[PDB]
Design an enzyme around this catalytic site. Structure first.
Site, PDB file in Angstrom:
ATOM      1  N   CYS A 173      44.015  43.459  46.384  1.00  0.00           N
ATOM      2  CA  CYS A 173      43.196  43.292  44.875  1.00  0.00           C
ATOM      3  C   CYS A 173      43.736  43.324  43.651  1.00  0.00           C
ATOM      4  O   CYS A 173      44.194  44.687  43.295  1.00  0.00           O
ATOM      5  CB  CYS A 173      41.715  44.106  45.241  1.00  0.00           C
ATOM      6  SG  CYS A 173      40.450  43.484  43.841  1.00  0.00           S
ATOM      7  N   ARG A 195      41.899  45.508  40.239  1.00  0.00           N
ATOM      8  CA  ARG A 195      41.448  46.763  40.295  1.00  0.00           C
ATOM      9  C   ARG A 195      41.430  47.314  38.749  1.00  0.00           C
ATOM     10  O   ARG A 195      41.153  48.597  38.874  1.00  0.00           O
ATOM     11  CB  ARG A 195      42.468  47.461  41.217  1.00  0.00           C
ATOM     12  CG  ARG A 195      41.991  47.340  42.807  1.00  0.00           C
ATOM     13  CD  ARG A 195      42.980  47.966  43.725  1.00  0.00           C
ATOM     14  NE  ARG A 195      44.363  47.326  43.720  1.00  0.00           N
ATOM     15  CZ  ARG A 195      45.354  47.820  44.278  1.00  0.00           C
ATOM     16  NH1 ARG A 195      45.211  49.011  44.721  1.00  0.00           N
ATOM     17  NH2 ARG A 195      46.509  47.066  44.456  1.00  0.00           N
ATOM     18  N   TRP A 237      34.280  38.940  40.084  1.00  0.00           N
ATOM     19  CA  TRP A 237      34.147  37.643  39.420  1.00  0.00           C
ATOM     20  C   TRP A 237      35.504  36.974  40.040  1.00  0.00           C
ATOM     21  O   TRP A 237      36.338  37.761  40.354  1.00  0.00           O
ATOM     22  CB  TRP A 237      34.028  37.761  38.098  1.00  0.00           C
ATOM     23  CG  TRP A 237      34.958  38.600  37.241  1.00  0.00           C
ATOM     24  CD1 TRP A 237      36.368  38.315  36.851  1.00  0.00           C
ATOM     25  CD2 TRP A 237      34.691  39.894  36.671  1.00  0.00           C
ATOM     26  NE1 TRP A 237      36.983  39.099  36.246  1.00  0.00           N
ATOM     27  CE2 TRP A 237      35.832  40.208  36.027  1.00  0.00           C
ATOM     28  CE3 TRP A 237      33.688  40.562  36.794  1.00  0.00           C
ATOM     29  CZ2 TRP A 237      35.907  41.468  35.353  1.00  0.00           C
ATOM     30  CZ3 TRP A 237      33.503  41.874  36.075  1.00  0.00           C
ATOM     31  CH2 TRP A 237      34.835  42.294  35.337  1.00  0.00           C
ATOM     32  N   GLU A 289      41.467  30.948  42.812  1.00  0.00           N
ATOM     33  CA  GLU A 289      40.823  31.220  44.012  1.00  0.00           C
ATOM     34  C   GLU A 289      40.215  29.993  44.434  1.00  0.00           C
ATOM     35  O   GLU A 289      40.208  29.379  45.443  1.00  0.00           O
ATOM     36  CB  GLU A 289      39.957  32.364  44.200  1.00  0.00           C
ATOM     37  CG  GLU A 289      40.417  33.668  43.586  1.00  0.00           C
ATOM     38  CD  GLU A 289      39.439  34.714  43.628  1.00  0.00           C
ATOM     39  OE1 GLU A 289      38.958  35.153  45.053  1.00  0.00           O
ATOM     40  OE2 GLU A 289      38.895  35.327  42.817  1.00  0.00           O
TER      41      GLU A 289
END
Ligand code: HEM
Ligand code: HEM
Ligand code: DP9
Ligand code: DP9
Ligand code: H4B
Ligand code: H4B
Ligand code: MTL
Ligand code: MTL
Ligand code: ZN
Lengths: 410, 407
Positions: free
Chosen positions: A108, A111, A280, A285
Site C-alpha cells: 500500500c 500508508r 480513496w 488504478e
C-alpha cells in the site's frame, strides 16, 4: 542485524531494524527471489504466544509495558484462551490492530494516512441482513458526499472455521461482467465469475456496461444472501476530458469508493475473515489498470483512434500518448466533481516522506517495490529510485481463497 | 521444488525446473525480500570448471563421452599444476553467450545466441586494448545496423595483473560541476570525468563531450585514448512535430557498451569484457534525459510545450515524458541507427521466456529491471510473474578500479 536501504536519486541511506520483528515468511529463499509472484482454525497451543506478542506491542505503544494493567490483561487472555480456546479483543486493541494491519501493508502506497482510519466494530453482527446494514453505513460514512474518509468495518472473528463471516464480493462496489456467446465481454471482465454466481443466486442483471453488483453476504457460516446497495449511496463520476470534448461520448464513468472486501485481517492470532476497508483512489488504478489493461475495459484503441494517432507501428508510442490523456481525464473528472482522488506523483512523493518518517520513528517500513511503483511513468516518480525491504509484520491483511471454492452449501 | 510462474493477462502458466541448478545467493531470505536492492583456490576452481564443462559437453550432445572425460582430466591436471587453466575457443564462445543468456536483468536476451565474440586473450598492453576496442566499436556500430558483440581480455591471475576498462561504458559523456553549483554534462560521470582530467585529458567543457578511454593492462596504471571521433556514431534528437525540439540541442550515442562488469566462466574471471547490443528507447528518453539526477530535462521540455506545470495532476511531466521518448525513437530511426521501443522489446522477451521455459526449463528474470521505466502495465512483462536466481556463466558487478588500484 542492521540493513541499509538507499535512494539512488538522492543518495539518502536509511537503516532498517524493524525487520528483526518479522515473523511470517516471504516466499523467497537464499537461492530464489519470488518478489514478483502475486500469491507466493488455530490451536490453543499456537494462539497464546501470538496473543502475547500482540498485547506486548499494544501495551508498549501506549507506554504501559510491564504495568499491572498489562500483566492483568495477559493473565485475563490466557485464562480466556485456556477456558474457551479463543479470546475477545477490547475495543481499543481492535482499533490499534486494524490501524497497524494497514501500517504494515507493504503493497500500500497510501500508508501516510494509516493513523486516521475510522474503525467500525461490527462484532455484534449475527446475520447477512445485519451485515448489509453495517456495510451501507460504512459506504455512506466513507463516501461523505465525495470528501472520502478511510474506514474499515470488522465482523465477528473465525471460531471453528465452519461459521465464518464473509463478503463474497471482492470490493463492496464493482461493475458486473458478462461473457457473451460470441466470446466478447460486456462490462468488467474481471468480475465475470462473481457476476455468474450472483445471477445464479437470483440477481436480475440489467446486462449493461456499468451495472453495480449486488452484495453477496455470508454470516456465521450460512449460505450467502443477495442485497442491492441503495443506488443513492453509490457515488459515481462520469469521465470527461478537459480538452477533448469527444471523451465524454466514450460513455465511461467509475465509482468513487474503492473498498476491498475479500481480505482477512489477523490481529493477535485472531482471524477476521470479513473486514471491508476503504480509502480513496490513486488515479492510475482507474486510468491505467481498470481502463487500459487488455483484460479489463481495454479502451486504448478507441481512445487512440479518436485522437487520430499513428497506430501503424508501436514506435509512435500511440499507446503511451493515449494512456496519458485517459489518466488526465480521470483526475480532471474526479476533481471537477469534488470527489477525493490522488495522482501518482503526489501519492508516491507522500509515500517517500512517510517511509523516511517510519524509518526514524519505527526503525523501518516494509514495502513491496513491485506494487508501490505506479503502472505508468514509473521512473519519474520518486519510489522507482528507492530501494525497499519487503517483510511481513502482524497484525496484517492477508489473502484468502474465494469463498465459492470452499463454502459448504446448506 | 518445481515452481510455477503465471501471466495474469493471458493466464498462461509455466513451470520452472532450471532454478534447481542455481548455486549463487540471491540476497533474500525466507524472512526478507531484497528484490529491489541494486547491489545485494585450486580446491574452489576445479568443481567450478567441472560444473561448466559438464554443461558444455551436454550442450554439444557428448555428455559422458571420452572427449568430455579427457577434457575434464586435462583441465584437472592443468589446475593442479598451473593453479588455473585456459578455455578452448569453443568453451569461451559458449561461455560468453550463456553469461548473456543468464543475465536476469536483460530484456533483450532473445538475441543471446547471435553474439559475436572477440577473443582478446592475447592482448598485453593498454595500446593493444585500445586497438581491440576500436575494432569492437567499429564492428558493432556497423554504420548504424548494430550487431551484438563482446571483447574478452586476459583472465585474472593473482589479482595484481588485472585488465580493466575504467570507463562504465565504452562511450559516455563527461560531467563537470560548475561554479554555479550546477552540473554541466552528464552528472552520472562527474567523478570519472575528473579522474580523466586529473590523468591528463583536456575537456572541451561541453554538455556532450565523448569521454576518453582509461585502459588498464596487466595491473599497470591506466592510460588515456581518444576513440576516433569518426568511430563514435551519435544521433541528433529532433521531434517529428515539434520543430522547436532540435533547439534543446540534444543528442545521444548509438552504441550502448557496458565495460565495467566481470565475466565468470567455469570459475575463471574476466575483469575486462566490454559488450554491446543496441538501445531500448526508454533507456535514453526516460532515464538518461528525465531522471532528476541525469540531464533532467522535463521542466525545459514542459515549458516549450506550454503545459500547466502548476499542479502535478495535470500530468505535464507525463505528457512531456512521452514526447521526449517519441523524439528519441524518431531520431534514431530517421538516421537508420538500430533502436527498439519498449513495446516491441518486451513482447520479444515474453516470446523468449516461453522458448526458454519449453527448451531449458526456465529463464531467470528480474521483474524490477525488466519492466520499462514508463508505461509499465501496458507492456506484457508487467503482468508476467518472474523468478529471479543466479546461474553461471554470468556477468557480475565489481568494484570501481580507482578504489582498488595501487598506482
Ligand atoms: C487513503 C488512501 C489510500 C490509497 C490512495 C491507497 C492506495 C493503494 C493502492 C494504489 C494500492 C494498490 C492497489 C492495486 O493495484 O490493486 C493499495 C493496496 C493496498 N492498500 Fe491501500 N490505499 C489507501 C487506503 C487503504 C486502507 C484504508 C487500507 C486498509 C485499512 C489499505 C490497505 C491496502 C492493502 C492491504 C493493499 C494491498 C491489497 C492487495 O494485495 O490486493 N489501503 N493501496
Ligand atoms: C541487442 C539488444 C540488447 C538490448 C535491447 C538490451 C537491453 C537491455 C536493457 C534495457 C537493460 C537495462 C539497462 C539499464 O537499465 O541500465 C539491459 C541490461 C543488461 N544487459 Fe542487455 N540488452 C541487449 C544486449 C546485451 C548484450 C549483447 C549483453 C551481453 C553480452 C547484455 C547484458 C546485459 C546485462 C548483464 C544487463 C544488466 C547490467 C546491469 O546490471 O547494469 N545485453 N539490457
Ligand atoms: N485505493 C485502494 N485500492 C485497492 C482497491 C482497488 C484496486 N485497484 C483493485 O482493483 N484491486 C484488486 C484487483 N487486483 C488485486 C489482486 N490482488 O488481485 C485486488 N483502496 N483503498 O483502500 O483506498
Ligand atoms: N542496452 C544496453 N544497456 C545497458 C547500458 C546502458 C544503460 N542505459 C545504462 O546507462 N546503464 C548503467 C546505469 N545504470 C546501470 C547500473 N548498474 O547502475 C548501468 N546494453 N547493451 O549491451 O545493448
Ligand atoms: C506479475 C506481477 O507481480 C503483477 O502483474 C503485479 C505487478 N505490480 C502490481 N502493482 C500494483 N499496484 N497492483 C497489481 O495488481 C500489480 N500486479
Ligand atoms: C531502487 C531500484 O532498485 C532502482 O531504482 C532500479 C529499479 N529498476 C531498474 N530497472 C532498470 N532496467 N534499470 C535501473 O537502473 C533500475 N533501477
Ligand atoms: O469474478 C470473480 C473475480 O473478481 C475474483 O475471483 C477475484 O479474482 C478475486 O476475488 C481477487 O480479487
Ligand atoms: O563518474 C563515475 C561513475 O560513472 C561510476 O562511479 C559508476 O557509477 C560505476 O562505474 C557504476 O556504473
Ligand atoms: Zn526476494
Amino acid at each position: 542485524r542492521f540493513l541499509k536501504v538507499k535512494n539512488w536519486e538522492t543518495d539518502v541511506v536509511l537503516t532498517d531494524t524493524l525487520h528483526l520483528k518479522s515473523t511470517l515468511e516471504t516466499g523467497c529463499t537464499e537461492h530464489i527471489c519470488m518478489g514478483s509472484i502475486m500469491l507466493p482454525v488455530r490451536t490453543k497451543d499456537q494462539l497464546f504466544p501470538l496473543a502475547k506478542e500482540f498485547l506486548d506491542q499494544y501495551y508498549s505503544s501506549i507506554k504501559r509495558f510491564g504495568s499491572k494493567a498489562h500483566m492483568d490483561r495477559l493473565e485475563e487472555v490466557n485464562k480466556e484462551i485456556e477456558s474457551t480456546s479463543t479470546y475477545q479483543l477490547k475495543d481499543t486493541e481492535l482499533i490499534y490492530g486494524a490501524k497497524h494491519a494497514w501500517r504494515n501493508a507493504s503493497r500500500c502506497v497510501g500508508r501516510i494516512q494509516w493513523s486516521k482510519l475510522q474503525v467500525f466494530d461490527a462484532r455484534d453482527c449475527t446475520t447477512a441482513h445485519g451485515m448489509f446494514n453495517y456495510i451501507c453505513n460504512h459506504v455512506k460514512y466513507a463516501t461523505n458526499k465525495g470528501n472520502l474518509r478511510s474506514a474499515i468495518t470488522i465482523f465477528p472473528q473465525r471460531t471453528d472455521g465452519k461459521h465464518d463471516f464473509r463478503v463474497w464480493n471482492s470490493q463492496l462496489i464493482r461493475y458486473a461482467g458478462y461473457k457473451q456467446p460470441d466470446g466478447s465481454t460486456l462490462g468488467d471482465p474481471a468480475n465475470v465469475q462473481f457476476t455468474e454466481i450472483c445471477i445464479q443466486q437470483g440477481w436480475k442483471a440489467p446486462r449493461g456496461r456499468f451495472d453495480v453488483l449486488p452484495l453477496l453476504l455470508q454470516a456465521n457460516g450460512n449460505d450467502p444472501e443477495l442485497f442491492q446497495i441503495p443506488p443513492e449511496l453509490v457515488l459515481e463520476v462520469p469521465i470527461r476530458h478537459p480538452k477533448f470534448d469527444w471523451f465524454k461520448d466514450l460513455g465511461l464513468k467509475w465509482y468513487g469508493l474503492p473498498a476491498v472486501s475479500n481480505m482477512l485481517l489477523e490481529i493477535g492470532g485472531l482471524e477476521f475473515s470479513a473486514c471491508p476497508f476503504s480509502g480513496w483512489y490513486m488515479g492510475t488504478e482507474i486510468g491505467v489498470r481498470n481502463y487500459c489493461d487488455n483484460s479489463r475495459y481495454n479502451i486504448l484503441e478507441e481512445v487512440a483512434k479518436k485522437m487520430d494517432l499513428d497506430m501503424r507501428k508501436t514506435s509512435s508510442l500511440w499507446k503511451d500518448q493515449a494512456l496519458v490523456e485517459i489518466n488526465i481525464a480521470v483526475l480532471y473528472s474526479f476533481q471537477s466533481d469534488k470527489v477525493t482522488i490522488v495522482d501518482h506523483h503526489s501519492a508516491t512523493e507522500s509515500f517517500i516522506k512517510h517511509m523516511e518518517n517510519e524509518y526514524r520513528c519505527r526503525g523501518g517500513c516494509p514495502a513491496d517495490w513491485v506494487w508501490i511503483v505506479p503502472p505508468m511513468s514509473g521512473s519519474i516518480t520518486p519510489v522507482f529510485h528507492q530501494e525497499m525491504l519487503n517483510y511481513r509484520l502482524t497484525p496484517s491483511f492477508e489473502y484468502q481463497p474465494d469463498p465459492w471454492n470452499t463454502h459448504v452449501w446448506k
